[PDB]
Design a protein around this ligand. Sequence first.
Ligand SMILES: Nc1ncnc2c1ncn2[C@@H]1O[C@H](COP(=O)(O)OP(=O)(O)OP(=O)(O)O)[C@@H](O)[C@H]1O
Ligand SMILES: Nc1ncnc2c1ncn2[C@@H]1O[C@H](COP(=O)(O)OP(=O)(O)OP(=O)(O)O)[C@@H](O)[C@H]1O
Ligand SMILES: Nc1ncnc2c1ncn2[C@@H]1O[C@H](COP(=O)(O)OP(=O)(O)OP(=O)(O)O)[C@@H](O)[C@H]1O
Ligand SMILES: Nc1ncnc2c1ncn2[C@@H]1O[C@H](COP(=O)(O)OP(=O)(O)OP(=O)(O)O)[C@@H](O)[C@H]1O
Lengths: 473, 473, 473, 473
Amino acid sequence: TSWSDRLQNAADMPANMDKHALKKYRREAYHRVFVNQSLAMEKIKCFGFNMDYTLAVYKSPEYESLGFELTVERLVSIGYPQELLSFAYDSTFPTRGLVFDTLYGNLLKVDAYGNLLVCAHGFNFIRGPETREQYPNKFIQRDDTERFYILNTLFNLPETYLLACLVDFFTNCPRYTSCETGFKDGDLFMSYRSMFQDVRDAVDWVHYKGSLKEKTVENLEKYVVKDGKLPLLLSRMKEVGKVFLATNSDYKYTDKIMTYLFDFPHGPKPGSSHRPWQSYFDLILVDARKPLFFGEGTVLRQVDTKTGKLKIGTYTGPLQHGIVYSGGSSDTICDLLGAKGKDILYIGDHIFGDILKSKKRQGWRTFLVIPELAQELHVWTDKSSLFEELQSLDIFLAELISSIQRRIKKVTHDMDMCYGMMGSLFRSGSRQTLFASQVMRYADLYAASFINLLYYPFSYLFRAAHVLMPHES
Amino acid sequence: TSWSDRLQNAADMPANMDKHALKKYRREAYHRVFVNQSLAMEKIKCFGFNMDYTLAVYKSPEYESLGFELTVERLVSIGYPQELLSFAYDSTFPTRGLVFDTLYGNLLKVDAYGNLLVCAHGFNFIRGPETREQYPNKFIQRDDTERFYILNTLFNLPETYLLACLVDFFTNCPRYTSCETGFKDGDLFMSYRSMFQDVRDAVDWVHYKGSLKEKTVENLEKYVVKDGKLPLLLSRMKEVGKVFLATNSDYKYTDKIMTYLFDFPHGPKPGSSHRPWQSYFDLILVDARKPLFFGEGTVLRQVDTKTGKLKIGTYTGPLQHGIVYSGGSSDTICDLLGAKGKDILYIGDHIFGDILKSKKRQGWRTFLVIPELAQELHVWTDKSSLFEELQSLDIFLAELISSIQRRIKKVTHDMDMCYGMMGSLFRSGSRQTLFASQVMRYADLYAASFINLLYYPFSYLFRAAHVLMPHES
Amino acid sequence: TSWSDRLQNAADMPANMDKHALKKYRREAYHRVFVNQSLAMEKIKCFGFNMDYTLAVYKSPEYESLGFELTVERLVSIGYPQELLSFAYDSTFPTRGLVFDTLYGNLLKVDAYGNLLVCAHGFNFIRGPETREQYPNKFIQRDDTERFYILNTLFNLPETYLLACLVDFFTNCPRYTSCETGFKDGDLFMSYRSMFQDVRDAVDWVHYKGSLKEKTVENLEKYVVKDGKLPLLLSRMKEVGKVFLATNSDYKYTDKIMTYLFDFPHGPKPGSSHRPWQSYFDLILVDARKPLFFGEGTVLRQVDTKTGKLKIGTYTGPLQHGIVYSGGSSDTICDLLGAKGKDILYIGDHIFGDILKSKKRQGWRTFLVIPELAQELHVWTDKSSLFEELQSLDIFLAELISSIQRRIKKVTHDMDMCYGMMGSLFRSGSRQTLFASQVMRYADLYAASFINLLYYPFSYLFRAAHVLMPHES
Amino acid sequence: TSWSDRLQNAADMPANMDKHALKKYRREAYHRVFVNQSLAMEKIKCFGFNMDYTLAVYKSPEYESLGFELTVERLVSIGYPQELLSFAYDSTFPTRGLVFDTLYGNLLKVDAYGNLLVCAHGFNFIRGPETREQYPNKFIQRDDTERFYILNTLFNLPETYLLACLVDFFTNCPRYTSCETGFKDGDLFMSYRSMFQDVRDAVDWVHYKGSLKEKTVENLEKYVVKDGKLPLLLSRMKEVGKVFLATNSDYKYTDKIMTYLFDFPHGPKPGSSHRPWQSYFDLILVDARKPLFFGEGTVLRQVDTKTGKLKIGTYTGPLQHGIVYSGGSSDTICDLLGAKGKDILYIGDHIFGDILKSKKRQGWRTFLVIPELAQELHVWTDKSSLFEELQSLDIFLAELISSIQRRIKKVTHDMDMCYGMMGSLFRSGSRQTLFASQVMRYADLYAASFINLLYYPFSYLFRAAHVLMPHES
Ligand SMILES: Nc1ncnc2c1ncn2[C@@H]1O[C@H](COP(=O)(O)OP(=O)(O)OP(=O)(O)O)[C@@H](O)[C@H]1O
Ligand SMILES: Nc1ncnc2c1ncn2[C@@H]1O[C@H](COP(=O)(O)OP(=O)(O)OP(=O)(O)O)[C@@H](O)[C@H]1O
Ligand SMILES: Nc1ncnc2c1ncn2[C@@H]1O[C@H](COP(=O)(O)OP(=O)(O)OP(=O)(O)O)[C@@H](O)[C@H]1O
Ligand SMILES: Nc1ncnc2c1ncn2[C@@H]1O[C@H](COP(=O)(O)OP(=O)(O)OP(=O)(O)O)[C@@H](O)[C@H]1O
């Protein structure tokens, strides 16, 4: 039972729009919209979306496996050993948001202050005292961006597992001598950095030059979550404001995916005429290149919607029905729709490129879609006993014979393993992750699916608990 | 009654070291050490200090006025109008941590997300709807560092008031035509940016080339808080670990100030032999150049303690008794004292250069000294009624005829004016400031004076409330 | 009669190696090696080559036309108008070494001090007084590299003509409104900069992703000059030193071209066994990435000569027979062959990336191959009368009724048109070009073909006239 | 007999303005204007000057000794050993234009291609074979600007000698251990780089904060060459165009020096009323900050000529009589005087900041003043026998028993020593220096004094020999 299965079970259900059924529905956590900063919806005038893993949630683990197979094939085709072809993606290992250390070849799970919480070299999890040789302060300098790559998105889920497989394969293959910073193959040296780069380059190649998009479109029911409540919610959004799409995908792919997402024998509700997906949007912008999009951006261009290619030159005209933009910046959207930042609720999945940057660079309101949260919420309500036992041991230990500290590390471990081999997305025991930090800080609203917005009336006031400093209480 | 008066009233009292008197004393808030992240003191092996506004708290407003007089004189001496000589520092206007906007010449008080909370052009406070011409989203891009300067330190207190005086003087002096971005003087244009720079340059000149240090030393009782509990606390720190000084001042000035700070007819306790201040330190490092200090730093040099000048060349020797260092980096301290980051409790006043950078760059534990907090704590406990009335109106308004929203803005204003014309350091009404945000995030411990550490036993476990995400509860 | 026809007439002749026949042969200018700085060949220990337009001179204009056809097709395939397909490369317009001004869309021919010598907008040559609107000082800032691109190589010959065709087509096509900095197509704007970029990008794409290499290999006799004196000269070079190849091409293409260049029924001389081309080289390095090659370079890699792909990782081994390198730096060559800079004679065609950078960055001796010089030499000896008449008018005008200055500009024009519509490579009348300047400065030796080195004994002392300052004479 | 003595002998003579006396006078080389690029004076509309070592030639060696004494004193005052006070400037060692290598502490004399011509470590001149340990190719990468500083100006004459003295003192003082890259003083290390910096910083301090300007003004007849032909030439320049001053000095110092330069009991000719120096100028600009001046420059300011301080703000007004500018750019001059680049003859002494940059960045015509050339010209005409003997041996050696090559190196050495211990400014034997290269390339006209322009009629056509490539002849 994967997180994408819960989303597709809830998607197969028709919208009960009775005012009482909505209140009762959003009482359950799997359908709630969770609040980090107060937000009054009657001040929202423009609703903004990205596509990949927001409108178009790719089914798990089929989509991560397809990415893993295709990336592995690319690496073999440029000269990596045939033993990669015998790997096989294991959705139980990787958790989203890990840091790969290109110096020593480890996956690290860190809190916001760069403290180590989990460290795995290949498939070998390194315990507290043994990490101190490489991490003398149990700490990483997050600013050292040449050394530490954060794997933020669900596209990074294959490479997260792939990076372990590779370290594990070379570590234990006798053709290679393991060194501190990589692998000697006789007279060739492959550093963990250059290996990381080869993986990284390959994933890029698979998305942009390879067969990933091709193979997704040819079996969309295997790969993309489809929900007939999506036309309904967007149509209700356009009744009270403007709806725009700002995606990093190209128009050809966006068209195929959106068409599928809207292919029903009806419009917003059952029994209405089916409309084309573009008619649900006041502004459709592709090739967004976020997060540069929220700074100076790129030259603004016009898509030839018949051929799918860009017209030649910079677009200088007005917003007209059925025009489609490529590139540009976030200001392009604000000028054309005549909106200020806090007018906009931008709905996205990239904690950094979608959410943080729009918040910090433009003052946009942010809604972060967290697909894994549909499963994680279940695990959390079925093991509330282990976390509650953890909160109790933390409290008793404070009142204090350190045989307690070893029962804490054990309960920690068992709680963590329920989510995966790399723990929960948001914490390792009582200690929160960098991801969790960035959600709380930069995401006003968050949820397992944005479709949860449908169960809230369009005047609602999302409330957040006021923050008080220590001395202020 | 200034914040520096409370600190000097509490400094004139001898240390009652009875185990019960200490518990009872730190029950009052003016003597508490406030906790943002749990910290176990038995893991602290090195105690680190900066000098200015930590060990050497300059008395207010005498020190801010001396800085204001000296800066004003410098500006007149390089060609500014004689009317500056008739200004006079007003400690009731400036609050620490404001942002000066060099484009439009305003002082802004902002939250962590760059939202405007107060905007004053000169001495004219601009209300909500009128700021929207210049701040269409009520927002500033904090990343635009050419436009927005944060006034972080209490040395910035004179310039904070001086910048208003100048905008107010030119705005209302008929020799000058006020423009959007500065002042026309016939055929000369002075932009708010170049004016800001002239002020900025002048303050620097006063500290490094002018008479500020000279005039401080010649009347230390007028200017520096002195406390006989300081020798005691440092001597107790050296009983359980190592004590180092990392200050940005030069050795000559550090020597004069520290000598004064330790001039008593006794040592740590009454009746003991007086020791020189240097003997309270395992490592004394001047000319620190923070925050670059926490990165690559500067070349490490040796001070000639007799002449006060640097020896020629880079120091390459070991730590010996009575050696004094200039420059270097934070690694210089860790190697020589043989300490890891989380071993160190660095005590400082610069939220950015002392606290943030050591936390984020090196994993150091941080203690932030907030001198204003001695007065602010009083104002807060004597007007708890207005804040509690504010929390109530915020709650009732949520249950909701918007005549409530105007009683909120009025109570906000009256609460704020109790702290100054620019509000409290930590909030404007229910909304917290960027400073408050950075304290909670990067300062493990904070207090009005570090001497509050003396009232805690050296095994204490400072505890912080665990943070839970919305869905986690 | 193109420059590549003279080279192939002289290539079809067998080497007369009689000591007297060589002296007499190199008396004619078409076979001379021309000297800019004295060079003693007995001090040369390593001979270095690049491939494209040095070892492998592509026949003209067939190769420039193939590049022009392929580039034009690419531009139409990404959305440029169908009228490009009716263009047709005209080898009489472009001269090598022009500057394209991306601001105003002109091809300029400039001297070393950035003085305009010819300015053509499209196919319209702009006269002296009319250029002063756009070029008020008849001058360009060569340091402004965003504005001015120098077309240095014979690969730039198609784009040189293509850039005119495009300006001429849009200028005179009524669908487009000509502006100062580009072309309005209703609501799209194509600046001369973005147009230049589109051309530039296309040429790159044709070489690296398109069909240019493919179509060259399938008809090498149409495209590549072949000479049986090349095996002989290289074999004589290896008798007195070391020979290395440092080319920017990949191994697959290098192999196909070199194989052809050496496909004869014999070795160095007629009647000897044929050897493979690799055996003429002590070190074979591909993927050179010059001119970065002469700085820090790139990671050094090893080619799998069977598959043609790079092995995985950085090469760390020694120079062994039959190893082939990819990337690296110029130091890689010096260490492995144990040579100092002035030991090396590097033979190349890129005045900047081959010649200047090796001279200025590493002290290498330089030999520049100038293919056009085979035809240019002819034009020069058949019109020596017009240049001599120009030198006379320049002298008489100095003795001086400015009806002389108009006979000078007329003789200038007629002399120039003999070389092309864009004049000679080295001068426009009495005034030398930037190219000519850079040859004299950075090329020790130069010639129409490096094969001219065969007619000099391997002890020869190339002599250059000593330079005297004005006051020194 | 120093170069400044010849200039002051020729300055003490009144101008014979008879048309025949001028022709005959400029037949001698000490009064000629030497030509590198043809220049027609009737096209010159604006004459531009810098002050230091152009208008105000500081007498030698008194001014270099005053700089050497003052710099040495500064270094002792910041902690350098007392033995410096016993140094004493020796005008026979340093030649202008040397390169100091901050890695190995050597003064190098190099040609344009970075070839070593002389290498002295301290006062020890290193011969050919011994430099190959540190300079394996007898070559330096001129682009490595962190390692190699060019000493371009006559202000660099003291530091040139001072750098040798220091290397020589530490090398042979037994308190210090000489290392490859500097000097160990027990536990302090002084690298040649940091030593170079200390010298460099000190020279700056002496000019800007020290007593050099003060002590020059108090004895101008000891320090500044004065000539009554200077008012005459400038007055003749203003009869046929515009005259502007663009100097890097401040207004106070410029005023004192210019006043002296013009203090005579008469105006341009004897018997005319004396005018103030400012009246000889259409535009007077101080604080020029060249060579940035020829790029984006600095903010343009206005000098208060009464107080000598800058007014506050950016100047925005027109050119009016008696206004004086500070900062700005070269465009400021062209706009205000309404001149194109090739209208301007800029007269200066900085081969790089005055001459090269104006030529390459703005197309300005350049006149380089070379004070040493007054003596050097004498040495050259009195030893023409040794150079002519050198040209003969170079020719005979080409016809060739290498006992010739050792007579060449000996004649080279004896010719060189006539100019100084560091050879002539322009060559070492038959090989020209980088300086000589940059003069020929970027200086249209050059001379020992610009006053030599007075002996040429204001219509003159300076002619230069046309350059022909090898194959073109
Ligand atoms: N999730 C992320 N993915 C990629 N880059 C990131 C992410 N979060 C932060 N960064 C970038 O990494 C760099 C280093 O992070 P650093 O901790 O120095 O700043 P920061 O993230 O703003 O700090 P904090 O979040 O603790 O306030 C910054 O340039 C930041 O923009
Ligand atoms: N108090 C301060 N004083 C000076 N500079 C600061 C201060 N706080 C942050 N900065 C710097 O200002 C720049 C812009 O701030 P930005 O908001 O982009 O990052 P940030 O402060 O890390 O963000 P946040 O604190 O919201 O996570 C950054 O380079 C940051 O280091
Ligand atoms: N043929 C060329 N192709 C491309 N770039 C060049 C060429 N020649 C010079 N450049 C580069 O163009 C830039 C600007 O040229 P600039 O005239 O400022 O320097 P330069 O060429 O060394 O000058 P000069 O050759 O007149 O001494 C420099 O970075 C230089 O390296
Ligand atoms: N006399 C000088 N003083 C200081 N810097 C110089 C001088 N001459 C050149 N430079 C600078 O030194 C740097 C390195 O010189 P480099 O030889 O790479 O270029 P260049 O001087 O233009 O070359 P060339 O003069 O041989 O054409 C360049 O940035 C150049 O501007």
